[PDB]
Design a protein around this ligand. Sequence first.
Ligand SMILES: [K+]
Ligand SMILES: [Mg+2]
Ligand SMILES: [Mg+2]
Ligand SMILES: [Mg+2]
Ligand SMILES: [Mg+2]
Ligand SMILES: [Zn+2]
Lengths: 159, 176, 138, 132, 44, 337
Amino acid sequence: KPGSMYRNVRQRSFTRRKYMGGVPGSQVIHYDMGDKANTSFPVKISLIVEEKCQIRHTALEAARITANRHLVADTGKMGFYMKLRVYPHEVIRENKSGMRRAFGKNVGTAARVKPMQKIFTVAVEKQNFKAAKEALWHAGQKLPTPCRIVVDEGAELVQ
Amino acid sequence: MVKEIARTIEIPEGVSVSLAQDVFTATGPKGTVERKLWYPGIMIDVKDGEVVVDAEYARKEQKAMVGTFASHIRNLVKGVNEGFECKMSIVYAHFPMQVKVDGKTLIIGNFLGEKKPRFAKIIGETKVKVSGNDVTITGINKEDVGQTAANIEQKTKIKRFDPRIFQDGIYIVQKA
Amino acid sequence: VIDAKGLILGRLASSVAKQLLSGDEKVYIINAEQAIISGSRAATLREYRETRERGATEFGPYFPKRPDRILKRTIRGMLPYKRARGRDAMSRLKVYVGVPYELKGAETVTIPDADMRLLSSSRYVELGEVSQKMGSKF
Amino acid sequence: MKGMRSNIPRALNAGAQIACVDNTGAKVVEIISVKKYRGVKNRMPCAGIGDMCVVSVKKGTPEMRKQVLLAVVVRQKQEFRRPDGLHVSFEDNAMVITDEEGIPKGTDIKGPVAREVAERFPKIGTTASIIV
Amino acid sequence: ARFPEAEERLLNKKICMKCNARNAIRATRCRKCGYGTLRVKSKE
Amino acid sequence: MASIHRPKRGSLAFSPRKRAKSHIPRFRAWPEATGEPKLQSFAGYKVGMTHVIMVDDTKNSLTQGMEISVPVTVIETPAIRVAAIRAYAEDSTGEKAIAEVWAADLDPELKRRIPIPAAGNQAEALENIGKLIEEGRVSDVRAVIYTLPKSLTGVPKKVPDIMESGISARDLGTKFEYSKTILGTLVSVTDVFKNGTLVDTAAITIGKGTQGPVKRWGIQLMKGKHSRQGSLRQVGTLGAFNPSRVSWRVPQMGQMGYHQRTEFNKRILKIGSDGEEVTPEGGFINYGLVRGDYILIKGSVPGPSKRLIRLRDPIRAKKADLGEPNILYISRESKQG
RNA sequence: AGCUUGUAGUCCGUAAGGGAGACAACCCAGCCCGUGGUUAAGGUCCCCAAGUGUCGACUAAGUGUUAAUACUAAAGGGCGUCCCAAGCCCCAGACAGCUGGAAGGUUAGCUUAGAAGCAGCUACCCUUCAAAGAGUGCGUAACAGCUCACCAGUCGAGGUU
RNA sequence: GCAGCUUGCUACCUCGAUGUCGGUUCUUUCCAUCCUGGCCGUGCAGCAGCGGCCAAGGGUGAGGUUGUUCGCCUAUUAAA
RNA sequence: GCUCAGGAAUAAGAGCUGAAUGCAUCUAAGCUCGAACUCUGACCUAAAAAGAGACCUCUUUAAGGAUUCCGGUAAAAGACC
Ligand SMILES: [K+]
Ligand SMILES: [Mg+2]
Ligand SMILES: [Mg+2]
Ligand SMILES: [Mg+2]
Ligand SMILES: [Mg+2]
Ligand SMILES: [Zn+2]
């Protein structure tokens, strides 16, 4: 089931789970990676999507896995802090007959993100800026939107 | 500092470079050579034993073209003055190649045991000499000498076998 | 008598078509093999072999091969040649490979705005090269 | 294969039940296909003298019967011409069991073999009593 | 055996990992497709 | 759909399959000169077929050295007359005839084809052609020849057949000199072709009139139950639904035979002068007997008996010098047996 | 979905004429008849009335020459080319080439008789030195000439992210 | 993402009828290439493979079951 | 019975020279090779090619054509010889 199905935003939100029934649980396990009790990381880069889209929980999990693997391999187990900012709140549904009673059944969850919205933020030391940049580039390849990396803190510390 | 696109070519004594029409002609002790060098936006001037190639504009294409034209002019004057020599080596494992010149072609017989000899073409007034187990290629044109050496090396290509075992052929050891 | 040497094919064709539709002269075009088509050689050859090999045999387009016939066809597409005015215009046009013996020594003219030295690059081919790569003997 | 000097019509097509004329225990074999024969649409595989065919032993011993074997046709009733213009025809069609190389499985061949198979397969020639 | 002058021309080039094209020993990018990763041609 | 494939029925290399526009074959190409000047073509009349026993001299053949029976076509080849010299000018639009000089004396039966050119300008016409050659206006010279079938008896016609023949020479001046030598003479087939060599034969093939697609293109018949449902010798379909038309490549009825055909690499096995050497007992059926000099061509030739066969030196021959054949026996037995 | 079902405006339906190649409903325009004039939309190389128009750039792909459009291909990539900006190095001589040394460390420990710097897990390895590491290569059953990361001189201008 | 060659979805055309499936016959096209031609890589010694690129000129068959399409099986075949 | 090629220009690709980018670089210009593809070459057809052709011969109350006649190398009628 391709991500192009539940990708475009054409509809209102579908998030009130007390008026629906049976939502499959999200695949994304953690939302904070690296060293969670460190705040004195001078450089902080984030990945912002540049289109209004819906990101499925499986896409978020895939991007998170790839970025976390790259960061752990390059900077080490606690050489970085990584935050997945958005939670999949939207419930995705599918119509599984034809068009009669076509209101779908819940098949997953997605995060409805806006243009220029931060998806992932990574904090590292000065020497790991390019590694964090590379990891976030790999993470954005798993997402259904074009992305761009921005430096939030420590711009003068990289160039 | 100041970027200059124009390039200067010195004309050694005995070399009479002319640029009538859009064709460049160089005459020297080793012979005479003539090449076509035309490209819009590039200008070539011959003056006082010195050719200068300049472009009207300064974009990357004009920079590349002035560089290429200056290199061609320098090679032409060198060819009319000092010429070019290209060295190739004859290597074989089991079958001794029979290599000889029959005019404007090089006969490569018994290559890998074949009953039909190979034929490599000579370009221009290029001088190919089989110096025993090696081949020397000389001429006034760097284009012609390079192409003649390339023809010799490409004609001796083992086109199906593993290159790490079958290595018979004639290979350039020094370019023009 | 227009000398087609070093002239853009479409611009020469447009000029000659308008002149023929101004309805006062017979136009002769010589050296049609020496007309120029701007653009890379691969693209022009690809498009001309696509046009040459297109139609149906009982029906389809019969795109010519001779450079003079190709040039006449190029002018033909800028005329209302199915109309009496266009038919009259096409009857007053003669295109030649080289110079015909009768027109030898006649005073020729050239269209200044169709000149190929107004092009900014060297990406061009002559019409004769296209014709001979399509298999035309001339 | 090596060419014969004569022109042989491919007289037998697939399904033909030919008498086997060697001492291998096969009495009647049926042609299944013809080796080195590519056909065309709707054309049955065709075999004349000198051709090797895949056959099925229809009659003979129980050991031989129902076996897919190779056989070479050595006689054919359809007339074929020798190089000097003479046309030759036999009274019947005959084959002998062989391998891929053309070596007979049997040891004696009852009846005459065509000279063409005798040259194309020398062992069939030596095994045969008379070559016509 | 193996002649070094032949190995210079036969085995001393890089290979594009996406199109397999031969490239110069010093090339960092494939000329045919522009791929950024090139491996030396395997001489063993 | 999973489809069974079949090569297309017949050749589209001879389309449209219409009647030949003349009873004479016209040569569209002429080979290159490889020796002394001579005519590149000859014309005879097909008599019939016989066979010879010859020693196989073909190199590398399996039957080389032994006696083989070879079918041959006998072609009567009386001397042709060189009627005219024609000069051609090459330009962008191809060759054009620029000059012609006719021989002063021409055969009286030539009037059956054309009004006879007079014995007028031959020296001045020849000098005009010489001037045209000197000034560069002439690209090549051809010889206009005609046959004289009156000497034959199996061919009923007395009206000559006129055709242009090339001259093979190394240079245009040599061609003009040779043509002036041969102008108005009678050339024998030995002056054009030598025994044992390959030639190309052109003729109009046997006419069969209007024929169906089964015979004309070799389409399949309807098979099995379809053989007796009313369309036995008819093509299965004329087309698809789209395109909405019958393609010209669909096999259809029409004229069969009486086309121009050229055969390649037909070997001359004997140049003869005595027609009794080849005429069988009882004569050739529907023809009679050979009277003048003849030629034996190995194998078959296009056309029926009495058709004009044009012989030209080969344009795509492969084998080198073949030799003189050793004909041990020419069969003169009755073709009527 | 040129799907289905709402809503506001406006159309076609029932809307000519002008223009978009043709176009129910897209643009101008709502239209009594005739004549003259000037415009609208749209266009001005020819087909085709009017620009082979002007200025300043870009594109090399015949890309394109497609208002809306049911009639128009994405993610991803490009030392293709043209721009803007910010770091770092730079005539106290960069960037890439041409030359010149990689001499004291160690043959650092590794079951099996053998990978003694490229299986391998670890360093304030030299006093100090313009200059030599627990190692970047076709190569070694246990050693080696032949290539680097480095300061040196070289012509001499920008280089790099 | 492409295609529209599977099956769906849909109800725009056709109910004063556009004759169904499969096969057969004949013609044609596409290329996303099975063989044949040319190439590149290889964990390519040769033989032979595996992977990929160009290329649609020619070829791509015969049989047993089954109405089959599809598929299975047989023996040939350069490939079927 | 006959049924080849050869040449040209290319695809992928392999190279030469070559700058942008001092070096290097098959490429950005330029150049050499490179397929059963394409073109040419063979072969069939083709003055109804509207630019509706060239040349020669014969003759302008003729040249010559058709019809009738005897036929067949042709032929559904015509046509063709
Ligand atoms: K088909
Ligand atoms: Mg509206
Ligand atoms: Mg209504
Ligand atoms: Mg209304
Ligand atoms: Mg309207
Ligand atoms: Zn590549």
